Amino acid sequence: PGKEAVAMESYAKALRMLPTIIADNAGYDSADLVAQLRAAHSEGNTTAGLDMREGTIGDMAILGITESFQVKRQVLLSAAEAAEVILRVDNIIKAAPR
Amino acid sequence: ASLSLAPVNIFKAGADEERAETARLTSFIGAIAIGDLVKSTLGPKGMDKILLSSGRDASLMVTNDGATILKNIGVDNPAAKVLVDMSRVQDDEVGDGTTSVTVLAAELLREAESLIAKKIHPQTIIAGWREATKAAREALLSSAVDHGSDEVKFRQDLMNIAGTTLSSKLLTHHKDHFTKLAVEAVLRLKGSGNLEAIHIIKKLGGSLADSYL
Amino acid sequence: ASLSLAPVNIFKAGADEERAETARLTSFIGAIAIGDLVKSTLGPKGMDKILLSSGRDASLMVTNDGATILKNIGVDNPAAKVLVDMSRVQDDEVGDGTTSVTVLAAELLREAESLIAKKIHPQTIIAGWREATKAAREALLSSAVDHGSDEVKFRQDLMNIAGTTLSSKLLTHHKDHFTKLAVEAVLRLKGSGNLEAIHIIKKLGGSLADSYLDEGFLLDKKIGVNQPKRIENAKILIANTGMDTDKIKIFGSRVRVDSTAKVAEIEHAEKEKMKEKVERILKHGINCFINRQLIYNYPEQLFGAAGVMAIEHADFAGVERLALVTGGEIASTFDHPELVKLGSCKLIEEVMIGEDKLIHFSGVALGEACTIVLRGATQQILDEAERSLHDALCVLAQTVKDSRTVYGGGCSEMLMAHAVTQLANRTPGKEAVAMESYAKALRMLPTIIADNAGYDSADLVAQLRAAHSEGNTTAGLDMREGTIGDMAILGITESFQVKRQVLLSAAEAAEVILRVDNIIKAAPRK
Amino acid sequence: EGPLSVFGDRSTGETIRSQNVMAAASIANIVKSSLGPVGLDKMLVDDIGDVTITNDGATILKLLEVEHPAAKVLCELADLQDKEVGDGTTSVVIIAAELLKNADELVKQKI
Amino acid sequence: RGKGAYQDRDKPAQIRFSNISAAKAVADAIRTSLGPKGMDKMIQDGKGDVTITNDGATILKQMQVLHPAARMLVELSKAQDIEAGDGTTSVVIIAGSLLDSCTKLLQKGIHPTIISESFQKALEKGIEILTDMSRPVELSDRETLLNSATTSLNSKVVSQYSSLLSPMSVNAVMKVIDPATATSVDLRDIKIVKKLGGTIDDCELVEGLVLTQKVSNSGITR
Amino acid sequence: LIAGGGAPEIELALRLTEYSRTLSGMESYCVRAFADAMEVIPSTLAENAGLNPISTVTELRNRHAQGEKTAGINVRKGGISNILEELVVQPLLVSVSALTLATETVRSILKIDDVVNT
Amino acid sequence: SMMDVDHQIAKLMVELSKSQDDEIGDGTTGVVVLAGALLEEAEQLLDRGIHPIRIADGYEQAARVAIEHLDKISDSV
Amino acid sequence: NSGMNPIQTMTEVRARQVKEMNPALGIDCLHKGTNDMKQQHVIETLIGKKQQISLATQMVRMILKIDDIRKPGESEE
């Protein structure tokens, strides 16, 4: 409950905007493909991902699209952390440049 | 009142003090600029950038690596400097994810700009973001899979990970070739993580497929 | 290749050519800057701006009027210039909607930026926006109500509309007071739309509540020297004659004689001509004479000897308003008095306002013209009160012309957005997405109305959206307590003309700004 | 300056009173040497070689180029005495300046 | 619920505080010219035109104030000079003080709209209170008129000559109005002729006419 | 006619302090602010006269509370007194218009939230 | 410390916060806010005509009162 | 900073402190419901608060005691 739910929804939108950009860079219907992926992961197909050869959705387990848990976890945590520190700022006091 | 917009200015000639809305304005536009810069390099069909330095040597680089791109740019926005340092730290910790982390931070800050426009305190935002980070960490950890026990399955995961890392880079032309190279190069270490052990000699000439281990 | 980023530059020193993304960037940032500037003046709880011009006079204005704010700023973005002209045209057509159209266009362009980022062609967006504008027009027209038949209900709509127009302005302190004034001032026109007939005199001093609507008429001109100062049962001749060394229009005419005696005879003849003119005037049987042009010393003396009050140097506006309020005929020939209609007023006296004397016509015959005396503590207060009164009077005139009304408080915008949403969810393709963005901007109008007061804009707009989805087409913001209510009961109603013009002008300007993919500037003259 | 933001300078309190007294005193010291049977005359050179010898206090204060208002006041005082009486134009300036001096002394004592 | 409205923007508050500060600066600048013990200000125009004065409207109009709020206070003093012709300093001081109070009110976290309406409430109550304090007067009460004029003059450089200029200032008005029917006064009926020379003890009330235009005949003066 | 010497301002301050105590809410704070703001004219008169503004204004408030509403600052004696004995009277219109115009200008200035450089 | 101030009173406030940090290591922001508030109230007191030294002495007295009251309401861990 | 209305919240907690003698009543910055800081485990050091008060008061004294400034004012390099 509350506006924290709204900020959670925005967090989720940014997470979704990562594959959206991955798809945009190829030239596919990022909106269509990310919508299919969101529907699949809501359905329970936790292995649904982008197949970037033809521009569709597929099984990452079969296509061999896997990343290091270390890398993805660090991505998540460092991004959220830097966003947190940048969001805590309400004043920028610059000093006379040298 | 305010520090700068006060009848008396309290600062030395050349300083300045951006307040609430102006501070978030500079922060968000700088971070989102950095992010929009480093994206379009993201994914298999990502395209490279040229790092035409203006120095007396005018060094020239062609990169899809977000860490290198951000290191090699003259940034003056402090929030952009924060994101730059973040990508550098990603490159130090692991060797991948510098563009994914940069784009993610930039998109989070874009959404945070949207939320601040909705008249929400960036404390409710940071609280909700911490809760979301918790949930995301658990979902990631729960989805993670481990195959280091099975030697053959581990070899398959290593080949697949090397392929996924080189897919976004210029080596996707001969991905399979370099995939094998990288895998052998990491298996020759026999468990050690010393990457200084892996020497890379760059010899001009020949095709990129003439590369070997 | 490209026009600018080509091996050869094809332009004169100082020109430039912003391409696709850079052009949409400049356009969107300029329009959204304009919009974010002019909002916060929106709604009952809107706050004023200072227009500290840097000219040699450094004029100072305090306004909540979006049209004035945009007119009085040095803009350099072309899209911002488009929005500025749009607000000026809104101010010309009707007297309200100058801030709502600007905010609406800015919100539409913000949503269009979001959509273009989504990799949508800026043609599909305009297509969806045209469809949404159609749907919104039908929803608005279908929700509009007309009460011009029932005189009492029409009076209620006029009072409510004047109240809604003045709520946002500095006169909301004494809204009821000025509401009565504004309503009476337009009802004295008796159907005419001539707003030049409504004269507004700004007298420094006194409170804003000391302002009033004169039952008669007031004139800031002077009476002659040896002429009366009070006249009962006044019969008035309104004129546009010379009465000022009036020369025969033959321009080659010249007095050429051989004796000063003849020069003196001709001078006496000139004076006798002027005297006969004055006598032709007096043969109308008058006590007051108002001339658009001057009245020189000799006719002044004659009118004084005749016991006639001769007011001089009234303007075209003064004589037009006097003809409207008294019933007279503006005349320049007096050889057929039976054909010249005179004006009548029970009394003409001289009154004090502040430190100035004015001619007061009471008991006027027709009344189809008005005088509003505005008192205030500062010239800035007075100017803002005049602007707010002009807003209210323009809107009441537009309603007297077209009695169609539509409920306000975000009811209308939410309703149009509801219609656009119904259309959108039944439409296939990215046009549905652009329709949804159209609806988001329409919803962002009451969102801003609520923000400017300090309420939970999100919560209230959610309540309103749910109400308008349920079928309670009259739900709107009650800004006294900060809740939702029935605009029909609370008396928050707007002119259908004004809201329709807001919608259409905003969508049209956003359309023209969105069709742009290149901005080719020429070397500035400066 | 500062809060006011007026585009000018502002003197306030004992400062401006001291300035006014200094100005009046200056004007009186210009003419003090030309008072009585033992007073002496003054030359005045008009930046072009035009010379004027005089003992008349009104004349002296007319030829001078004064900028301070508290000194223009004493010049106008000498002018007024010259218009209305024809003598006393120096004594009146001296007396006005001395009244100012002693009165400012009293105001410093916070009378 | 939880938290309220974030108020993502701070420039409105900064503008409010700058306006309040400018107004308070004007008020405290002219605070010294208030009352019988108040002193005069000299103002040297850019052209060098000097002006000594104790009048608040004149002081504010003559010092080329630049801040918008200070400009508004200038117009306020002018409006008081029109409506009453007396009180042009008290009104500015009152305005500056009300704004300086709005400072701490805003700090407490009150909305400017609430402050304005509550000020209107206090204004209505204060109008009531002052009306209750007042006592009626008949224009035949020459002593009250003399005392009002003396009070008006106590603040000005012409206060040692008040014994002379109070009866003149009452005669002048009492000669240009019918005391039984008059509801106002037109001070253009009272002509003031400033002629250098003499002293303020030489001021005169001429019931007839005075003209600065010269006589053209030589030998015919009387 | 109204008394002078800051008597109307002092009576105003006092009675609006009372009115404020009756108006419990956030309007109470603003009305008390209006009162203490109107208490500045007597303070200024005292300061300029050469007296102690704090003590002088407190004595004025106390005597107006006792009931001598025609009590003000006698710069001739140097303290508080019935001001009509010094014959300090002024038209009610002056005080009323001053209050009205100052309040109107303040309300106008409070409705401002931005400044533009046209 | 990172703030590039040219006003000597701002320098005094920098010194004040640094002093709180030296002696305690916490409160470095409370001290500045509190001192600013004390001066903001002294502003109105000077407007009313009180001698600034009398203000300083009343502040010293009240500070003694507050310090002893802190000793009074204090708890132990 | 927590979005609450300053005057409202402060007056309510002051009234509660006076009525129920409890100097542990303060501002619910985290919105845990209770105003009792002794229950929320919000704890400051007595020397910390005392030093805040003492330092603020002493520096305010030195600042109010200054009535003249003479800077170089040259606007040099």
Ligand SMILES: Nc1ncnc2c1ncn2[C@@H]1O[C@H](COP(=O)(O)OP(=O)(O)O)[C@@H](O)[C@H]1O
């Ligand atoms: N065949 C593929 N199908 C779908 N996604 C892929 C494929 N190959 C790589 N990717 C994705 O492309 C991305 C490459 O990202 P990269 O440019 O290395 O980001 P960073 O520089 O942040 O590490 C990875 O996040 C991975 O998810």
Ligand SMILES: Nc1ncnc2c1ncn2[C@@H]1O[C@H](COP(=O)(O)OP(=O)(O)O)[C@@H](O)[C@H]1O
């Ligand atoms: N009592 C009220 N309740 C809800 N809404 C109101 C009330 N009074 C006015 N409004 C709304 O406030 C708005 C005032 O807008 P205004 O500033 O006149 O816009 P513009 O300058 O574009 O004409 C109107 O759109 C109307 O819908």
Ligand SMILES: Nc1ncnc2c1ncn2[C@@H]1O[C@H](COP(=O)(O)OP(=O)(O)O)[C@@H](O)[C@H]1O
């Ligand atoms: N022969 C004299 N003996 C003594 N005193 C004189 C004599 N002549 C003039 N004085 C004094 O000198 C003063 C100034 O004289 P003077 O300088 O000639 O006129 P002014 O002051 O108009 O320039 C006069 O007040 C007068 O009293």
Ligand SMILES: Nc1ncnc2c1ncn2[C@@H]1O[C@H](COP(=O)(O)OP(=O)(O)O)[C@@H](O)[C@H]1O
């Ligand atoms: N002799 C006196 N003794 C005490 N108070 C006086 C005396 N004369 C005037 N006052 C008071 O001093 C004030 C002087 O105000 P003034 O400077 O004339 O105000 P403004 O310039 O705004 O008209 C008046 O409000 C009056 O009440």
Ligand SMILES: Nc1ncnc2c1ncn2[C@@H]1O[C@H](COP(=O)(O)OP(=O)(O)O)[C@@H](O)[C@H]1O
């Ligand atoms: N959890 C909390 N709940 C309520 N108040 C707190 C809490 N934490 C800190 N505060 C208050 O915030 C104030 C500022 O503390 P802090 O910012 O941590 O250090 P500093 O006092 O140096 O600013 C303290 O006076 C304390 O009373």
Ligand SMILES: [Mg+2]
């Ligand atoms: Mg990679």
Ligand SMILES: [Mg+2]
């Ligand atoms: Mg309007």
Ligand SMILES: [Mg+2]
């Ligand atoms: Mg002599």
Ligand SMILES: [Mg+2]
């Ligand atoms: Mg006066």
